[PDB]
C-alpha cells in the first residue's frame, strides 16, 4: 500500500534552567526507527528499530551531525519567537516541527510536508505545491518573508521529492519483513450484562498493522455512530495496534447488531454478529 516517512521535532524552553529540551523522532509509517534526546548522555541519533541498527557508522555519524544542527536552530528560534510575540523571558514555550514525504502503492512520490507550530498552534506551513507558504499572523508572515528571500521552499522541495523518498524506499527494503508486512486484525466480541435490561457488546480488533482501521457498529443495517463507544487506535507495544467499539444492547436485541471491520489486511470487510 501507501507509505510515508516523518520526522517530528519538539523544542521546549526551560527559563532559568539552561538549554531547551529537544526531542527528535523519525517514523516510517507507524514504526518509529530513530530518536535523539538532548537530555541523554549519548548525544547521538539512536536506532529504535532492528532494521536500522546495522546501518553503518557513516550513517549514524551523519544523522547525529544533522540532528545537532537541527537542535541549534530550534534553540535560536525559541528566542526569535519570544521576541515576535513580545513574551516574557520567564515563560516556557514549545516549538514543534514536522517534515516528511508520502508515497503511493508504487512507492512513487505523492506529497511532501514541512510545517512549524508555536505553543500548539500552526505557525508556518509549506503548501502542497511545495512552492508557497501558509502564514496566519504577522509574526509568521515575517518568517515567510525571510524564507522567500532565502529560497527555503526550493531546497526543501529537493529533499522532499528526492532524498526523503529515496531513503524511505531504502528503509522499506531493509526493513521489509516489518515495514512491508500486513497483519490483519484478530477480531472477537465480548458480552457483559450492565444490568438485567441491558448488556455491553464490545467488538475487538487486535494485533493489526498498520494502524489505520475502520470499526463500526450497525443495528439492522443503520449506523450507530452517536451510540457507539469508540476508543482511539492504540499501540500494543510490540509494533501492532488495538481498537474496540462498544454498544449498549437492550434485552433480546443482540441479533440486530453487526460489527464491521475494514483493514488493509482483510480482503473483504468483516461483518461480525453476536450469535
Amino acid at each position: 500500500g501507501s507509505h510515508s516517512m516523518r520526522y517530528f521535532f519538539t523544542s521546549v524552553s526551560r527559563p532559568g534552567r539552561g538549554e531547551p529540551r529537544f526531542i527528535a523522532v523519525g517514523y516510517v509509517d507507524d514504526t518509529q526507527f530513530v530518536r535523539f534526546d538532548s537530555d541523554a548522555a549519548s548525544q547521538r541519533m539512536e536506532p529504535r528499530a532492528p532494521w536500522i541498527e546495522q546501518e553503518g557508522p557513516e550513517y549514524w555519524d551523519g544523522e547525529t551531525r544533522k540532528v545537532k544542527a537541527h537542535s541549534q536552530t530550534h534553540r535560536v528560534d525559541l528566542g526569535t519567537l519570544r521576541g515576535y510575540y513580545n513574551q516574557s523571558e520567564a515563560g516556557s514555550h514549545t516549538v514543534q516541527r514536522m517534515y516528511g514525504c508520502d508515497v503511493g502503492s508504487d512507492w512513487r512520490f505523492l506529497r511532501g510536508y514541512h510545517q512549524y507550530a508555536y505553543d500548539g498552534k500552526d505557525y508556518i506551513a509549506l503548501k502542497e505545491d511545495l512552492r508557497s507558504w501558509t502564514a496566519a499572523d504577522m509574526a509568521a508572515q515575517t518568517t515567510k518573508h525571510k524564507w522567500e528571500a532565502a529560497h527555503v521552499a526550493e531546497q526543501l522541495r529537493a529533499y522532499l521529492e528526492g532524498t526523503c523518498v529515496e531513503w524511505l524506499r531504502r528503509y522499506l527494503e531493509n526493513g521489509k519483513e516489518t515495514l512491508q508486512r500486513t497483519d490483519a486484525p484478530k477480531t472477537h466480541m465480548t458480552h457483559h450484562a450492565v444490568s438485567d435490561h441491558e448488556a455491553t457488546l464490545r467488538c475487538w480488533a487486535l494485533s493489526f498493522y498498520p494502524a489505520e482501521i475502520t470499526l463500526t457498529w450497525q443495528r439492522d443495517g443503520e449506523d450507530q455512530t452517536q451510540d457507539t463507544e469508540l476508543v482511539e487506535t492504540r499501540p500494543a507495544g510490540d509494533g501492532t495496534f488495538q481498537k474496540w467499539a462498544a454498544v449498549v444492547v437492550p434485552s433480546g436485541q443482540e441479533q440486530r447488531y453487526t460489527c464491521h471491520v475494514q483493514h488493509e489486511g482483510l480482503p473483504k470487510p468483516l461483518t461480525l454478529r453476536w450469535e
Partner: peptide, 10 residues
C-alpha cells in the same frame, strides 16, 4: 534520512 540544512531560521 534527515534534511541537510544551511541552516534556516524562523
Amino acid at each position: 534520512k534527515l534534511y541537510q540544512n544551511p541552516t534556516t531560521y524562523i
